[PDB]
Design a protein around this ligand. Structure first.
Ligand SMILES: [Zn+2]
Ligand SMILES: [Zn+2]
Lengths: 95, 98, 57, 168, 54
RNA sequence: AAAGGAAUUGACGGAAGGGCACCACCAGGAGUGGAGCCUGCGGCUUAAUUUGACUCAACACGGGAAACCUCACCCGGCCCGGACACGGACAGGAUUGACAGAUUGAUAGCUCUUUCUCGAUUCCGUGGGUGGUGGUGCAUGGCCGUUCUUAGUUGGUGGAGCGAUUUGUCUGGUUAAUUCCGAUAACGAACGAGACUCUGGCAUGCUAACUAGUUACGCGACCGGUCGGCGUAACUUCUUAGAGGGACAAGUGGCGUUCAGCCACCCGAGAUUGAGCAAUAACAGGUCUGUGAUGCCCUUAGAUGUCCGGGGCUGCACGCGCGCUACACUGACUGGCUCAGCGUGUGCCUACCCUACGCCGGCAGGCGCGGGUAACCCGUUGAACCCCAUUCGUGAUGGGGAUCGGGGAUUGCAAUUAUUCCCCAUGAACGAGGAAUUCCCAGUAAGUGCGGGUCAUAAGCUUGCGUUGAUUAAGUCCCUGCCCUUUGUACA
């Protein structure tokens, strides 16, 4: 879907920020809970993570109208290349 | 004048930890006034059993009891930290105010 | 019948129609979120910049 | 602030969603149940599993991932949650672990009867008094029916089905 | 679509303003004490919350 | 490619005999059925009057009391939330947003006219998918109802039989009960019943306490007394709630194969308190409309996804059922008086709360300072019926308050097809209901109110709480179902 690049790189920078991703099934929330500042919609995160899923870059669970997203190592090198990084910087799950 | 307030859903763990706390405070002999038994609040939700409403209309009755107690003591208010370190048994939770 | 879809209309190389060669060929939009190159379209009884949705006259 | 009743209800909903989510992720781990113990230095969440080596992932990746997702989803603060794995003594006396084991045997595929008799034989060899396993559904052909596999004795009514009988 | 008429209806004070907190249904809810589950999802997790038949 | 013989278990009968149950009658009570009204269902109309259910085991049932959402359903329109891969496109720009004006029901760049912003996320066809409260509960799970809460069900060693299988589990007595006694080729057991958990009934004996009370005081107020009127030290009777105790057919008389037990009566708080739980195993029972439980089929962009708007489920020559209100003098209407108890109370998601007291109105209400996350404030919960005096005088009357007009307030984005409330007006059958039938055995039926649910507004329904509180039975198989034994089969 046709979003700004800034909200998309804030979404991908959130996933590189902590390593995991949870959304709240929300079609109609105006703002994300963590991402109210940087102005991200929740539909942006959910369809951005489905575009990650449909190539196989994230592992998904859905429980109690909450999403869970677990990043593959294909996503680790992909977020080392799409987000532009020094090669010694690791996600917080590996520290 | 520090009052420790205990709350649980079962009576036996709460009775053991209230007995242990008054034994630890009667071994050091502060002024402790005894456990004051506040009345139990039953949360009852009476739902229907059947998921589509076809049968002979039998009804289902759930409940949960909340047992609410307290102990009140007069002491220095930093002596009081050393009694609430033995009370960490699950169920019962401790709220302290002065 | 049927309701038709909207296709993006194609004016061809209007990028030199923002200038006249030094001297611009259309008038400027006053803005703080826009500016430094942002002009208003001069229609026959109105004047139009896109982002502020501003009409003049 | 908030009531005593609404506090007890909302903590019960926390137990319900935590056990449901941990069942829905952790099929492979031997997940049987969770244990909360809350002290205000650190709030401690203890998972019951029979095989810890699939709980950790790669050098403990998924247990720190689990700490991170419980910190993110329930609104937990930065650094009040850490996550442990307790070893359960008997797999054959927990119905959730054996229910997952029969589920994994039948989902990876087997005869249904030799699966159920391996489960009944292991439960009666582990030291229980009794067992009952019903696998029902489209067993043989396209018409569904009940198939019951029992051994030993079982108590069925009264108050002692609440502490002598484990079900799943 | 337009973001001035799409989902412009008030989702305060409605039967569509509340739903089950587990299974996304709005019918036959249990609103008391902040459960907000429908009755079926009460009866699955009933002993897991602590509501016990006695 | 079996037709047939003998024998066992089961199902079934338009056979014989026992047993149980107020989902049976008998003793009887309140009723129902006839009457207006709320509400569900059958039809009838609609563009739609969505839908599942049709004997208990459908019809106040989907916790379904829908004004929008709900919401499926109709009329018209926006929307990708078609995720990825192959190819077309493309920085001479893939393309997102958009003012005025035609359009529309619309302040939908919806589209067309018109021509600015944005800059590789994005657009074009393929494949594959996604979404469904769309079907089929006759592909299914989970769960629930029902046979059935009736008292049934099964191993081990032993007997009988070549064998399927049988006895154990029965002629009888007894039990609420395959509960027991007794008879006895059976002896010992397991599940169900019972035990068990929760509640009710007792305690001057324990533990006891400014969020609970008693009482001896000290003072204030009123003509020894009254004070819920203001504050102190001893106690745990009243409140709260734990730990143990307690009732066991134990004591007595009688009946009784002197055995199970049954009946009667003292001492006693109490001599069947009530609910949860619930076996073998089955039905083509209901539910794909609780489900991101689902298998397949379906539709998938002039959608059965998804949103916004008017409409619908509420319609009525008409049935059937749950209910409410009454047909009055034990009453009605007006004043006074005095008493409860289960419980609810400021919310991740999210606007939605219990209300004291003072001022203004005849009401719903308006306005402000307060208290409360609860044994603290509403709250001594000053509840209704019942009680004590006034009037009415058997009349369709002052019972009945159905239908029907104008007005005021509250909720809400919005009350028309009146949501609710109050003021005034209007006075319909109905005078105690026929064949059939429903429910019930002690704090019971019934009379009467108060909390919870659903809820922005809220109960003629349901779920509980108490209050006033009886007649009648202490049994039978006549009726209605059901189980069991013997018996017949060409039925499995
Ligand atoms: Zn502008
Ligand atoms: Zn529920």
């Amino acid at each position: 879907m046709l979003m700004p690049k800034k909200n998309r790189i804030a979404i991908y920078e959130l996933l590189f920020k902590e390593g995991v991703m949870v959304a709240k099934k929300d079609v109609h929330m105006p703002k994300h809970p963590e991402l109210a500042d940087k102005n991200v919609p929740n539909l942006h995160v959910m369809k951005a993570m489905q575009s990650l899923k449909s190539r196989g870059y994230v592992k998904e669970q859905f429980a109690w109208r909450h999403f869970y997203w677990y990043l593959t190592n294909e996503g680790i090198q992909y977020l080392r290349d799409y987000l532009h990084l020094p090669p010694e910087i690791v996600p917080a799950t590996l520290r | 004048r520090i009052r420790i307030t205990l709350t649980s859903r079962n009576v036996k763990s709460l009775e053991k930890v209230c007995a242990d706390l008054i034994r630890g405070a009667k071994e050091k002999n502060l002024k402790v006034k005894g456990p004051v038994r506040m009345p139990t609040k039953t949360l009852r939700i009476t739902t229907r059993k059947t998921p589509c409403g076809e049968g002979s209309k039998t009804w289902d009755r759930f409940q949960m009891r909340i047992h609410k107690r307290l102990i009140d003591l007069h002491s220095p208010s930093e002596i009081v930290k050393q009694i609430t370190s033995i009370s960490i048994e699950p169920g019962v939770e401790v709220e302290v105010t002065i | 019948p049927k309701k038709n879809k909207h296709k993006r209309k194609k004016v061809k190389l209007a990028v030199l129609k923002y200038y006249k060669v030094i001297s611009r060929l259309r008038r400027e939009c006053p803005s703080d979120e826009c500016g430094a190159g942002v002009f208003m379209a001069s229609h026959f009884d109105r004047h139009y910049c896109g982002k502020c949705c501003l009409t003049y006259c | 602030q908030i009531s005593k009743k609404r506090k007890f209800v909302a903590d019960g909903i926390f137990k319900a969603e935590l056990n449901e989510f941990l069942t829905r992720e952790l099929a492979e781990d031997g997940y049987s149940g969770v244990e909360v113990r809350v002290t205000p230095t650190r709030t401690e969440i203890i998972i019951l599993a029979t095989r810890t080596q699939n709980v950790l992932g790669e050098k403990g990746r998924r247990i720190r991932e689990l700490t991170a997702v419980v910190q993110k989803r329930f609104g937990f603060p930065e650094g009040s949650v850490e996550l442990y794995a307790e070893k359960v003594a008997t797999r054959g006396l927990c119905a959730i672990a054996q229910a997952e084991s029969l589920r994994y045997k039948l989902l990876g595929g087997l005869a249904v009867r030799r699966a159920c008799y391996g489960v009944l034989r292991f439960i009666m060899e582990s030291g229980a008094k009794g067992c009952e396993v019903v696998v029902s559904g489209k067993l043989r052909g396209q018409r569904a029916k009940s198939m019951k596999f029992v051994d030993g004795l079982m108590i069925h009514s009264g108050d002692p089905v609440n502490y002598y009988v484990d079900t799943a | 679509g337009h973001q001035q008429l799409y989902w412009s209806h008030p989702r305060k004070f409605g039967q569509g303003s509340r739903s089950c907190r587990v299974c996304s249904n709005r019918h036959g809810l249990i609103r008391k004490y902040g459960l907000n589950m429908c009755r079926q999802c009460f009866r699955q997790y009933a002993k897991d919350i602590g509501f016990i038949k006695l």
